[PDB]
Design an enzyme around this catalytic site. Sequence first.
Site, PDB file in Angstrom:
ATOM      1  CD  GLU A  69      -0.028  10.830  36.316  1.00  0.00           C
ATOM      2  OE1 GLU A  69      -1.303   9.993  36.566  1.00  0.00           O
ATOM      3  OE2 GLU A  69      -0.639  11.833  36.972  1.00  0.00           O
ATOM      4  CD  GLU A 145      -2.510  13.731  31.418  1.00  0.00           C
ATOM      5  OE1 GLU A 145      -1.487  12.810  31.621  1.00  0.00           O
ATOM      6  OE2 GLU A 145      -3.205  13.497  32.458  1.00  0.00           O
TER       7      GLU A 145
END
Lengths: 211, 1015, 174
Positions: A69, A145
């Site tokens: 991220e 994820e």
Amino acid sequence: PNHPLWYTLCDRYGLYVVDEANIETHGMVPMNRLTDDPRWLPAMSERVTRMVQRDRNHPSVIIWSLGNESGHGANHDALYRWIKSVDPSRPVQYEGGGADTTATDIICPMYARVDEDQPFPAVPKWSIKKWLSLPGETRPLILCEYAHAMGNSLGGFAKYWQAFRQYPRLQGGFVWDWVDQSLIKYDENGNPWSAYGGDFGDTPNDRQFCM
Amino acid sequence: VVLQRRDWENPGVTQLNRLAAHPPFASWRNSEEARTDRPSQQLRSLNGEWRFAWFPAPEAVPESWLECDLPEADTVVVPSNWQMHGYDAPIYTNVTYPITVNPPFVPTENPTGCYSLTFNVDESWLQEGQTRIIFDGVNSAFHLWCNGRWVGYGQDSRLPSEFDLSAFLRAGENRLAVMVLRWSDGSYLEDQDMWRMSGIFRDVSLLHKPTTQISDFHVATRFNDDFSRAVLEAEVQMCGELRDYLRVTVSLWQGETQVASGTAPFGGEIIDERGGYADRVTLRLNVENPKLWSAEIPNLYRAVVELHTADGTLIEAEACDVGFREVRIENGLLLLNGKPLLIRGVNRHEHHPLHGQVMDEQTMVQDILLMKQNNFNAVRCSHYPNHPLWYTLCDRYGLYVVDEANIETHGMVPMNRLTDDPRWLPAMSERVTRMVQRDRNHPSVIIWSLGNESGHGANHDALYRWIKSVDPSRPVQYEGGGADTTATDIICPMYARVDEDQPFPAVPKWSIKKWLSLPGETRPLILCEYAHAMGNSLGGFAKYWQAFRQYPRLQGGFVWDWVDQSLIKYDENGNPWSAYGGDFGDTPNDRQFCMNGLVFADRTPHPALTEAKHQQQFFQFRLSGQTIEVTSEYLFRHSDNELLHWMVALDGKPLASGEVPLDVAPQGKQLIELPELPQPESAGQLWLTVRVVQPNATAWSEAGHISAWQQWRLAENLSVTLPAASHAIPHLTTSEMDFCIELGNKRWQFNRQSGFLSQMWIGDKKQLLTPLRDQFTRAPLDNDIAVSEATRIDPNAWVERWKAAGHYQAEAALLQCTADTLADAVLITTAHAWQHQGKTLFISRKTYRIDGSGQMAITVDVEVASDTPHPARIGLNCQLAQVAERVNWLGLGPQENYPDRLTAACFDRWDLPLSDMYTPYVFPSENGLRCGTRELNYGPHQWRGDFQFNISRYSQQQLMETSHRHLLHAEEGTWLNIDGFHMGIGGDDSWSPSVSAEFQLSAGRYHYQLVWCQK
Amino acid sequence: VVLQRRDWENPGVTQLNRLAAHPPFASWRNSEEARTDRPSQQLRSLNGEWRFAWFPAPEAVPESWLECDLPEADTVVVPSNWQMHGYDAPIYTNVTYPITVNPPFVPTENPTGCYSLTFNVDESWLQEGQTRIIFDGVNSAFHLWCNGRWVGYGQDSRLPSEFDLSAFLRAGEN
Ligand SMILES: OC[C@H]1O[C@@H](OC[C@H]2O[C@@H](O)[C@H](O)[C@@H](O)[C@@H]2O)[C@H](O)[C@@H](O)[C@H]1O
Ligand SMILES: [Mg+2]
Ligand SMILES: [Mg+2]
Ligand SMILES: [Mg+2]
Ligand SMILES: [Mg+2]
Ligand code: NA
Ligand code: NA
Ligand code: NA
Ligand code: NA
Ligand code: NA
Ligand code: NA
């Protein structure tokens, strides 16, 4: 990167490891504000290079990750190439900037759905079955994820596994995540209880989202 | 703190408080000034007289210097290198670091230059906005103080360092203190083969920007398939407070015509889950039928970037020159505007013989003009980013540029020791990234380079990908680690040969033709360095150009290099002389190896330059019968400033001449039909010479500029008519010691003990100071000597083999000396053996035939032992008594030419002053040869035949023994070397044998013949 | 110098005098020990009871602390997070930085953990060779001193920082 013993245990017990650099700049606006900035290259490079130098002999490590991220910046491309050059033995992945950038050997989205597109501007999350066959795409897809296990969750888990089994190039994924990040506090009777964000006077906080 | 931290011995700290890099700024507050590139009041120069004090180390610098002037200081011009002012010595070393190799440490004796300046700052500059100082070049590291307070620190000698001075300045008088270190950890990345100097050697300036400012802008130009449509994209970034009323306008101008304009508020497109850049905007402008930029036609537009308010109040403007061009590699070819380039390039260091490494506009313009006048179209910034004006001039005059990061670690063992080390990645990255950030908007820059001679390390791969990611508009190249690594888009070897492989372990240099077709190889090949032009060099240059033209994927190269790195020293009378490594007490050093130029340090051309011009011609020629076919090698321009002049001559005597205008499309052909040529009365060889003349002046050339030429042999009529028999008959007088031949006021004396013509008499006047003897050696050229590092000797070097075989020691031994009387001539016959330590190297057998016309016919037949190293020459030499003013010859000229460097020379009748027959190479050697000569005239003498010659006041012996040109003395009379045969000069490189086999004297037996008469 | 340079507000400085990273080392002087992965006598753990004092900022740390134990310090277990000992609050935030976004600057109120250890070193370790200290994880940045003298600095919370102490140590107590 984890405690050094972790890799020794995964070597001996047998688990495949994605070893990930300590780089996350989620709260920047935009997400790549630092990772596209050459002044931050030196600090980023050390988080990547020193990880590789530490862990490269562990058989359990099968994939290198550039972090999490932090959008997609030029520093990612540079460090991606650095790893490919120093260690050809392992693929490199990185989700930022749309999960399928030039900085990743594996299409590695987070929370892309089985059948449903989520066409977010610039960073869409395509149906995983659809993502595979986009014009020009050839890479394997492994979710970094998926199946967010927050509280009473994991609805639709079987839909993922049906697709993983049917499609050769859908090679699975990593559930988010293993263990609740609750912390122990003590009430007036001395009894321990499970605490989350805000329970320590921490403010602002994001409450039960650590679990 | 400054002494404690030792930032100059830490590759982790390359700067403190330095501002972000960016393209050239002027902070105009008037849009019209921005458009027309007029000076800006917001950009002030601090060049001129500064104060300077030299110290042996930073520990020796007194604290008081921070607060006030040292009375011991001197006043000096800045920019400058302090070695040029005599404070310490410049050091010339090639590979070996000038400091002990112990990274990141430097010597404790670290020469420290303390610069200071008292200057005025007006209050208006401090009341609002930002005042920054800019150091465009500081070698090699520095700390900065302002009015006593520490500001910051900077490394990288070749890019600007900028610091905000806003909080340090006061109204009125201020003082800067700059402590410059000669050595730093940055020096480990600065091992370029050049003079090691230091100081504030580029411009110093102050720039005022408003608080709300343009902080960066990038210009891109994209095209459709046939370049009839373009989109100009300008990304603009700001610093300061964002406000809804803020705007950016980008306007494009063609001369005084606005062709396009775009305005927008700040706020970029969404790039990720957190949104976009609120402090950036991208304007897109459509341009129909843009005029395209190239080195052929450097069409430029002007882009003006205005930061303003919605209601029209200007805040500030910046601008740059825009060249519409596309650079791409496609199908193994480097394309510019869709056409394959042929790179006529040269490497150019920033060097001045008086000012060291300080560059000025005049020197830059002079270099560009000479380059273009000599058919170069490209320059490599060996090996660092240049002075910013260089790119502006290349944009405007039209030259393709390889911009190169200031990274060279040649002296490391192995070469990639630092570049493969992740600890040196930060330092390396700044040298690459800050170059791109500065220079990315220049149309002249077409290729990025990762540096020079630093092996191949993982750091190179990372920085290669960084550039590819931020700037897809330009290929990236890098030579280190074998010239074809994964860090290069172009196969870019240095000194790879045309046909010959050099299979060095790990880093071989293949024949360039072979390299292209290695299994899996698809890239274009352009030599980053080739044809090492050290001294008497550039042998075999035509072989490169023949190959470049035949093979599509051979797209040229950059000659090494433009200008000799010689420095000026003065003798006791104040006379200047050219100095090189070792002349400043600098030790260790690599002597003359800093001098590799096509031109002398003062920009006077070496003979090699004309060979470069000719081979790099933009028009090609073929002759078929009466037809000349002219082919254009231009990609874009029609030949709209060209005319063909033709001339037919008979042994130098003009017979016919004409002119035809050239009207050739790019890549096209034109046929020119010659008129019926009148048959010549006399015997001899007819020659056709054509030349291309530019009738009109340009920005880069004068009217009447010759850009191309070519010769062909035409009809030859052999002389069958015998000379009318002379009535006179020469007389032989024999004695025990001599054979004398007399004919009127003419005597020829042959010594019978030595077997040589020891003297000739015209009346009572001696003609010879030294007997006419065979010569098989030359004063060794730099290429012959073949040394790149003063320590290392290559036993395979020509000079080494010649010395070891005894060529320079060889003693003539007489075998035969006889005289005969013919009906109308005297015939002398001699034979000599040249021997060294029992072994016979050469045998020379001669006849001298003297007839009634007073002509001496010399026939020479030489045997060379097959196991002796091939000799440099097979000829005769003597010292003539005469010193005459002119040398006149029919043969190749006018300039110096050698067997493997004579393509530029034309056959004709040439007449020069004697001094022009000597080439003043700083390191003296064999020089001034002219080849293919049929007739030579000097004073009373004439020689005829088919020979090569040089003529001068310096013997081969003096040239062989003298290390500097200024130490040469004119000898008594004139030394003449006449060769039937002369070896090539080589030059593919200058540190190993480089003379191609076809130019070596390997035939075993040689024959030549000369006629010596009085003119 | 240490308070002046503010290395923790400069991404150009991520370490000082830190040794190169490498794979796990134990420096066995016996090959059979290396083969069997038995403990090495040349690799010692400094885990256990250390001394700790909390401060609101590095400017609040007294110079005396470099030389001797602060009487106000406590004896705590190391390795640890000092939030788990009650010295200040752990913060749970997802995306939004727990500090004002003003790179490279951090708050002036910057919680500072002052750790110290008195430990013994065998004389044999100082007669020959190199003695280094390894911090496998320090969150988020730290300066190191040994016997009052400054050694180095390190960043990156999740990789080991190593420093040569060969010239800083004495036989016995350090
Ligand atoms: O004047 C030489 C020129 O060539 C390039 O390489 C230098 C040369 O140095 C020798 O000592 C080595 O043996 C050889 O491998 C190497 O080619 C260099 O890029 C230029 O800057 C300059 O030195
Ligand atoms: Mg440094
Ligand atoms: Mg070099
Ligand atoms: Mg001017
Ligand atoms: Mg820091
Ligand atoms: Na599958
Ligand atoms: Na969470
Ligand atoms: Na070609
Ligand atoms: Na050189
Ligand atoms: Na014309
Ligand atoms: Na000489």
